[PDB]
């Protein structure tokens with residue numbers, strides 16, 4: 001196949017522009033996933049009460065602090081209660097002789113008249129729109145889990161459709177679906193409808209993610225392929241900073257979702273000027289069209305040797321890859337070789353731990369640091385050197401020590417974040433950023449490592465099991481926060497424990513770096 005690329009250019013203008021065009025789309029795709037740190041930010045909130053809020057009433061000399069003491073009981077955080085109010089104004093709390101036990105729980109009622117939300121940071125959020133608070137607290141992580149389950153289902157559906165219809169066609173319509181469904185969610189009338197449209201948006205996110213990487217590799221010479229995939233991975237690192245920058249300017253959830261959805265109408269349009277893969281076209285017995293794509297690429301690269309692309313040269317080079325079709329295989333085969341049985345388990349575990357920890361932590365930055373814009377920016381900025389240093393280390397020290405060290409350090413940083421006292425918010429922010437950086441480095445390490453642990457017959461089946469494990473763990477990520485009602489440290493303890501246990505397990509894997 002690489003002879004056709006050499007007659008067409010395996011690295012050059014076309015590959016450069018293709019890499020740029022796909023990197024930008026991956027940045028915006030990353031913004032789509034990270035959006036609910038801001039679109040679904042929780043404002044500080046309290047019950048609606050007549051004295052505080054019915055401004056049509058008779059004015060008085062009492063200042064808002066006294067009215068807040070008189071109207072709403074204190075809560076766990078040494079702050080006003082977010083879900084209860086006094087049944088009648090408690091004037092007896094105003095005197096200096098008052099005490100904390102001067103009232104009883106029977107004197108308090110829930111927010112019958114609704115909530116009042118802080119508008120200083122955000123104009124609106126889905127939490128404030130649909131009151132995803134108090135008894136409905138679980139609905140935010142439920143929405144995030146529904147999005148990630150959409151990604152799981154979409155990745156399941158993508159493969160067969162990509163093989164049946166082609167990488168570029170499915171990528172094109174995935175772009176269109178992302179644009180439509182992102183626009184539709186921004187105007188949703190109700191919470192279930194918003195969840196439906198976020199699920200259908202993730203369904204297309206999965207296809208974009210898969211077909212972008214596939215369409216890059218199938219047009220890139222093996223010499224440049226690793227660098228190209230590395231740049232594809234850095235697109236998300238820049239997507240984090242892009243999310244912080246865009247969300248800083250747009251403080252309204254509708255406008256934010258709409259703004260991050262519009263770009264995909266442009267991605268849809270310029271996806272038509274891309275060529276379909278010639279490998280896929282020849283494999284499907286379509287040399288008449290593969291030739292057209294090949295000479296399109298050669299024309300872009302300014303390469304004259306399309307004159308030598310007599311159609312037979314296609315039918316005598318790529319044709320015989322179809323020999324691989326004689327033996328389809330399944331996930332269950334991985335565990336039928338006793339030498340691979342344990343290897344498979346402790347690799348899939350690392351994939352699961354990566355996805356679980358990353359989407360446990362990165363989707364509630366509001367719990368990890370005071371300022372979420374700067375914190376998002378930093379989990380973007382640190383991710384870059386983390387990934388590239390992972391590449392450097394595994395190119396020098398090998399795969400096993402790099403994966404083990406990254407996972408262990410990430411887990412131990414996240415555990416420390418619980419141990420550092422709450423007042424030292426700067427150090428907690430730094431440690432959270434370092435933990436997520438270790439998780440990203442572990443993503444790099446496991447992606448490269450899993451492509452080497454298994455025999456050629458099974459490499460892609462093993463990697464598929466790994467990727468599906470990562471998506472399944474990402475689904476469980478958000479739901480662990482429901483443990484937070486028992487204590488703020490418990491979800492973080494779980495998120496820190498999982499990577500430690502998986503990084504200890506990674507010490508048992510065999511090495512694959514060339515000697």
Ligand SMILES: O=C(O)CSc1nnc(Br)n1-c1ccc(C2CC2)c2ccccc12
Pocket residue numbers: 030033148151152209233236355358359439440441443444470471472474475
């Ligand atoms: O959430 C899941 O379903 C499973 S992990 C997932 N899903 N979509 C994406 Br984007 N990722 C991703 C999550 C995290 C990262 C960086 C390394 C920390 C990624 C880097 C490149 C590509 C995808 C990534």
Ligand SMILES: *[C@@H]1O[C@H](CO)[C@@H](O)[C@H](O)[C@H]1NC(C)=O
Pocket residue numbers: 050054056057058
């Ligand atoms: C608000 O105060 C006005 C004062 O006249 C009163 O008429 C009205 O019923 C009050 N509404 C509520 C909801 O308390």
